[PDB]
Structures are given as C-alpha cells and as structure tokens.
C-alpha cells in the first residue's frame, strides 16, 4: 500500500474563499506523474480523477472547480482544491485515493462547514 499522513477532518467558514483538503502520501516513490493516478471520491462518485498516463483531469458538472496541484504529486501531495460554491453544495466525508504503478491506498478526511 501507499501510506498516508492522516487527518480526521478540516474546516472552512464563509470567509474561506477556497477550500483545501489535505492528502499526503509518505512512502511515494513516483519517478514521473505518468506513474500516478488520483481519485477524490464523494458519496460514491468520483468528483475528481487525475490520470497521469494521459495527463488529464476529469470532473463532473457540479464540481467545475475541483483540481489538485500537479506540481506537488511527486512529493506525495494530492491535496484537493475547490472554491466556496462547490464546497458548500458538497459537505461531508472525502476519500483521497492514490495509485503509483501497482501500489495503492486511500485515506478519509471529513469536510466541515462550521
């Protein structure tokens, strides 16, 4: 498995213009982003997929803003970034799935809108 630096939950108020959900793999050894696949899951569906082999990101219509900092992937950072509009309409537990070659793992972070 890929191993994670876990986080129970994060928060963001109305003042938070953009929302960041932390995901950090600790035993990542990817040589190129082509080796990497990232899934951010929410209520079953994939609200964001990064396909490194194809170098493409896929999002549904509701999640028009969701993206990650691809520059950070090789470091093991697959944190998710979205605006306030997408955040409020989708509040709950998030699953961060990362795959490197054949190794895979996931971890859960709950988004709270206090």
């Amino acid at each position: 498995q890929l191993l994670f630096n876990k986080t129970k939950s994060v928060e963001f108020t109305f003042g938070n213009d953009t929302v960041v959900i932390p995901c950090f793999v600790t035993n990542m050894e990817a040589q190129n982003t082509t080796e990497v696949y990232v899934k951010w899951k929410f209520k079953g569906r994939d609200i964001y997929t990064f396909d490194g082999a194809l170098n493409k990101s896929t999002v549904p219509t509701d999640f028009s803003s969701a993206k990650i900092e691809v520059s950070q992937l090789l470091k093991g950072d697959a944190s998710l970034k979205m605006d306030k509009s997408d955040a409020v309409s989708h509040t709950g537990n998030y699953t961060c799935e990362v795959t490197e070659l054949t190794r895979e793992g996931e971890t859960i972070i709950e988004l709270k809108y206090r």
């Binding site: 498995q1 696949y37 896929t58 895979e104 996931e106």
Partner: protein
C-alpha cells in the same frame, strides 16, 4: 517493457478447517498503472478477498512487503479457514479509470476444506 503475466503456481490447495491457507500470486511487471485484487469466484457475484486500499481485511495477511514499490509478490495467507472459504481464488490486475477495469486475471487457485 512487456505485458504483465499473472502467476498463481498452485492449481489447487487443501487445508483442514480452523487452519490457514497460503494463496500464491506473482506478477512479471508493475505496469500498467493499477492495483492487484484477490477475488473468490468469478462473475458479477464474486467476493473481494483483498486489496491494498480498502483494508484491513481480517484473516488476510500479506506474504511479502507490499508497501515496497518493487514488490511483485501478491501472495496472501488466510487464517481460520471455513467451508465458506471454499472456491476458486483469482489474483487480478486492474487498470485505473472511472471505474477501474479488469486488465488480466490469474489462472485461479482452487481451495477446499477438510
């Protein structure tokens, strides 16, 4: 760079109830990007026995150090075998996507209980 082969050397394994069973699987390549999963049975009702992402899977222990990038041994040990554990176990390679698609399956290992 050649197409991965999935090798389950044992066509069949037998074991007394309450005891453990080793299910061997090795692959020849770590490509393409996507995980290995163990299933019992084939078809739409097959049962997920193990993967790296959705654990821990009680009763299932990995034979090798599967947190290592270069690991190609996906053999597992299943403890406390019951008659319910009987059937054919498939070590299966998947490609990433929404959803992940099955890329190639091992021959299968027939377990039976004494």
């Amino acid at each position: 760079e050649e197409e991965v082969q999935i090798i389950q050397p044992d066509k069949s394994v037998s074991v007394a109830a309450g005891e453990s069973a080793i299910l061997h699987c090795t692959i020849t390549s770590l490509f393409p990007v996507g995980p290995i999963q163990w299933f019992r049975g084939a078809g739409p009702a097959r049962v997920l026995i193990y993967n790296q992402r959705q654990g821990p899977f009680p009763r299932v222990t990995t034979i090798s150090e599967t947190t290592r990038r270069e690991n190609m041994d996906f053999s597992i040990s299943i403890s406390n075998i019951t008659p319910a554990d009987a059937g054919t176990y498939y070590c299966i390679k998947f490609r990433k996507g929404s959803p992940d698609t099955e890329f190639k399956s091992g021959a299968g290992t027939e377990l039976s209980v004494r």
